[PDB]
Design a protein around this ligand. Structure first.
Ligand code: HEM
Ligand SMILES: CC(C)(C)C(=O)Nc1cc(C(F)(F)F)ccc1-n1ccnc1
Length: 470
C-alpha cells in the first residue's frame, strides 16, 4: 500500500515486505538496524514499521529544522505507539495545543532553583546507597549494578515525587515500592508491540476495552494514592514541601500560575506517573553503564576520584553548587551518554507537506533522528567505539554539534528532566566514588555486549566488585 512511497521519492532504504514492512530487520535491535542502514544508504534512508513510513535524517541543519525550527508548525507530536487510555495526557504522549499547555505548566517545576531545593532530598539517599553498598562490599560478593542503582533510583523518585521515604533495597514489599517497580521500560520489539505494529488498526479496539500498555493495577494504586495525598496535604498545609507533587498542586491555582492556566486533577496524576516511568529504569541504566566504564577504565575512575576529593575534601557531602564545579564528572557522564543514548532514536510526526533543506517530506511521515547511529558515526567521533572522556573536555566540547550529540533530544520537546537526571546521577556517583572503587571480576563481561531487544541495556546484567576506600 504505502510501501512505494520512498521509491517514488528517490529515497534509498531496505526493500519492504508486504504487511510486515521492514520489521524483520529488527532481529538485531533498533541500534544495529540504524547502524547498518546508515552505512549502506548514506545520509537519508527510508523504512517501514508495518505500513507506517519512516524517514531517517542525518544532516545537522535538517535535524535542527525538524526539532527546533518547524516544531510548533510541522513536527509537533511523536508517533502513536499503542493504547494509552488516560495516559494520553502524559506530556511525553500529549499532542498539539494540549502538549504546549502542559509544557507551559510543567516547565517551572524543572527550573534550577526548584532542583536546588530538591538536592538535599536526593543526597539523603546517596548516603543510603552508600550504606547498602558498604554492607554488600563487606560480604566480598560481587554486586549486581541494576539492583543497587534501581533501588537508589526508586528511593529518589518516591521522595522527590511524593515525599515518601523508603529504603527500597531493604523494604522491597512496601505497597508503594511493589507497584512503582512495575513501571518498566517499553520493549517495542516484544511480541505485543510488534503485533500492534503489524495490526495498527487494532489499537482503537484495545482502547474501548480499557486495555492499557501501562498496568491498570499500578495506575489505579497511584491515582488513589495521589488523591489521598492531595486531601491529606490540605490539612498539614503549614509544612513547606518541595517534591514534584506539590509544585503541581500549587500550579493547579491559575491565579498563581505564570501561564494563567491550571492543571487538571487527571493531568496531574498523568504527569506524576510518567515522571516515575521516565526516571526509574533510565537513571539506573545510565548509572550502570557509567560504572561499567569506570571499572573497565581504572585510569578514568581514579582521576574522577581525585577530582571529587579535590572539590569535596574529607568526604564532604555533595551540594548543588559543588557538583556543577566538577568538570571531569560532567565529561564522564556525557561520554557515556554518547556510547549509550538509551532513547536510541528521536521521532516526530510530519503534520503537513513540507520541503526542508531541499527535500520534500510527505504528510504523515514519521521523521526519525538516529541518535545511537550518529553518536557512533566515525565521521564525527574518532575511534567511536572507545570510551574517551576527553571528547567533552572544554577544548574539544565546542567541536561537538548539538544535533549530532542528542542524548536528551533537542528543541521545545527535549527532555524536561535533563537537569534533574544529570544532578541525580552525579550526586550518586560522587557519594559512591567517595567511599568505593569498582573492579571487574571473572563474572564481568569485559567486552560488553548489548541486548538485541528494544531496550538499550547490557545483554547480561553488569556485575562488578565493590571495595571500600580506606
Ligand atoms: C538520564 C536519564 C534520561 C535520559 C537519557 C533522557 C532522554 C530523553 C530524550 C532523548 C527525550 C526525547 C526528547 C526529544 O524528543 O527531543 C526525553 C523526553 C522526556 N523526558 Fe527524559 N531522559 C532522562 C530522564 C528523564 C527523567 C528522570 C524525567 C522525569 C521528569 C524525564 C522526563 C522527560 C519528559 C517529560 C520528556 C518529554 C517532554 C516533552 O514531551 O516535551 N526524563 N528524555
Ligand atoms: C527507554 C526509553 C529511554 C526509550 C524511554 O523509556 N522513553 C520514554 C517513553 C515514554 C512513553 F513511551 F511511554 F511514551 C515516556 C517517557 C520516556 N522517557 C524516559 C526518559 N525520558 C523520557
Amino acid at each position: 500500500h504505502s510501501h512505494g512511497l520512498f521509491k517514488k521519492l528517490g529515497i534509498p532504504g531496505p526493500t519492504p515486505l508486504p504487511f510486515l514492512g521492514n520489521i524483520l530487520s529488527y532481529h538485531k535491535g533498533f541500534c544495529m538496524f540504524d547502524m547498518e542502514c546508515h552505512k549502506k544508504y548514506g545520509k537519508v534512508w527510508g523504512f517501514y514499521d508495518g505500513q507506517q513510513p519512516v524517514l531517517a535524517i542525518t544532516d545537522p541543519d535538517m535535524i535542527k529544522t525538524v526539532l527546533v525550527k518547524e516544531c510548533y508548525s510541522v513536527f509537533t507530536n511523536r508517533r502513536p505507539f499503542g493504547p494509552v487510555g488516560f495516559m494520553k495526557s502524559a506530556i511525553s504522549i500529549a499532542e498539539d495545543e494540549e502538549w504546549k499547555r502542559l509544557r507551559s505548566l510543567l516547565s517551572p517545576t524543572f527550573t534550577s532553583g526548584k532542583l536546588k531545593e530538591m538536592v538535599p532530598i536526593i543526597a539523603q539517599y546517596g548516603d543510603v546507597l552508600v550504606r547498602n553498598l558498604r554492607r554488600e562490599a563487606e560480604t566480598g560478593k560481587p554486586v549486581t549494578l541494576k539492583d543497587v542503582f534501581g533501588a537508589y533510583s526508586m528511593d529518589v523518585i518516591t521522595s522527590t515525587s511524593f515525599g515518601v521515604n523508603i529504603d527500597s533495597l531493604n523494604n522491597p514489599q512496601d505497597p508503594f515500592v511493589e507497584n512503582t517497580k512495575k513501571l518498566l521500560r517499553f520493549d517495542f520489539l516484544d511480541p505485543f508491540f510488534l503485533s500492534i505494529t503489524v495490526f495498527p488498526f487494532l489499537i482503537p479496539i484495545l482502547e474501548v476495552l480499557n486495555i492499557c500498555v501501562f498496568p491498570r493495577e499500578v495506575t489505579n494504586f497511584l491515582r488513589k494514592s495521589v488523591k489521598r495525598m492531595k486531601e491529606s496535604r490540605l490539612e498539614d498545609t503549614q509544612k513547606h514541601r518541595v517534591d514534584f507533587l506539590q509544585l503541581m498542586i500549587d500550579s493547579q491555582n491559575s491565579k498563581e500560575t505564570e501561564s494563567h492556566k491550571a492543571l487538571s486533577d487527571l493531568e496531574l496524576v498523568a504527569q506524576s506517573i510518567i515522571f516515575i516511568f521516565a526516571g526509574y529504569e533510565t537513571t539506573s541504566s545510565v548509572l550502570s553503564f557509567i560504572m561499567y566504564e569506570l571499572a573497565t577504565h581504572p585510569d578514568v575512575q581514579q582521576k574522577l576520584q581525585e577530582e571529587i576529593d579535590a572539590v569535596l575534601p574529607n568526604k564532604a557531602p555533595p551540594t548543588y553548587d559543588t557538583v556543577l564545579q566538577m568538570e571531569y564528572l560532567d565529561m564522564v557522564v556525557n561520554e557515556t551518554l554518547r556510547l549509550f543514548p538509551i532513547a536510541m532514536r528521536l521521532e516526530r510526526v510530519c503534520k503537513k507537506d513540507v520541503e526542508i533543506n531541499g527535500m520534500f517530506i510527505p504528510k504523515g511521515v514519521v521523521v526519525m533522528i538516529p541518535s545511537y547511529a550518529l553518536h557512533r558515526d566515525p565521521k564525527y567521533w574518532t575511534e567511536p567505539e572507545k570510551f574517551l572522556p576527553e571528547r567533552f573536555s572544554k577544548k574539544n566540547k565546542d567541536n561537538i554539534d548539538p544535533y549530532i550529540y542528542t542524548p536528551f533530544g533537542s528543541g521545545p520537546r527535549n527532555c524536561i528532566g535533563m537537569r534533574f537526571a544529570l544532578m541525580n546521577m552525579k550526586l550518586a556517583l560522587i557519594r559512591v566514588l567517595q567511599n568505593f572503587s569498582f573492579k571487574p571480576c571473572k563474572e564481568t563481561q569485559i567486552p560488553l555486549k548489548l541486548s538485541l531487544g528494544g531496550l538499550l541495556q547490557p545483554e547480561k546484567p553488569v556485575v562488578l566488585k565493590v571495595e571500600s576506600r580506606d
